[PDB]
Amino acid sequence: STTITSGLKYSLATGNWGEQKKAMSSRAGVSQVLNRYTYSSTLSHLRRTNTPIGRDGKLAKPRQLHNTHWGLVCPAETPEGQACGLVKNLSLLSGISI
Amino acid sequence: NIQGITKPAIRRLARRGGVKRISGLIYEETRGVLKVFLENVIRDAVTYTEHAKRKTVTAMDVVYALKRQGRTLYGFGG
């Protein structure tokens, strides 16, 4: 039984989404330590989104605020620097289909 | 590849066999005969090769096949 338990625990505790021996070539940062510095930081962290383009490539197009983003992702909240435009935040009335 | 055994080649073989004149249907016939011949020798040869657990047909395998087919061949025992 320790295989599934150890795998789920390793992935949720490290963020590397995949088998432990394939940490390279696996997505990293899928799981993160919940930010409890203040209340709004927690509320925002629980509603965050990530496009896995990567910084290897200077294509500014996927980092751009787009017309179709209206009402769906916040037009103002985005990290500065290398995550600008790749990490998005849901609008207050946004919802994800099940 | 049986067609690689050309009309001229068969003509040469027949010449060595003393043939002066050759019907047009001979060549195809010859191709059949040779084919059969090869099939019989090579078969046995491969059998020997398979018995020795090899992947390489040796001259000796061929020589043994020919011998057991009563086609004793001199010159390749070396």
């Binding site: 432990q20 021996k21 394939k22 940490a23 390279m24 | -």
Partner: protein, 48 residues
């Protein structure tokens, strides 16, 4: 086979970035820090 194992160990002892082959790996899954990797990069000996 064994001489080629020696060749591969000696090669990846010096350069673990050889094109078109697997990398000499460690117990934990990470690749071995070869000498070339010690010497190259922003964090290598020369620039770091």
């Amino acid at each position: 086979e064994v001489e080629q194992l020696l060749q591969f160990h000696v090669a990846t002892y010096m350069d673990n970035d050889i094109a078109g082959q697997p990398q000499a790996l460690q117990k934990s899954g990470r690749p071995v820090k070869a000498i070339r990797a010690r010497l190259k990069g922003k964090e290598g000996r020369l620039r770091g």
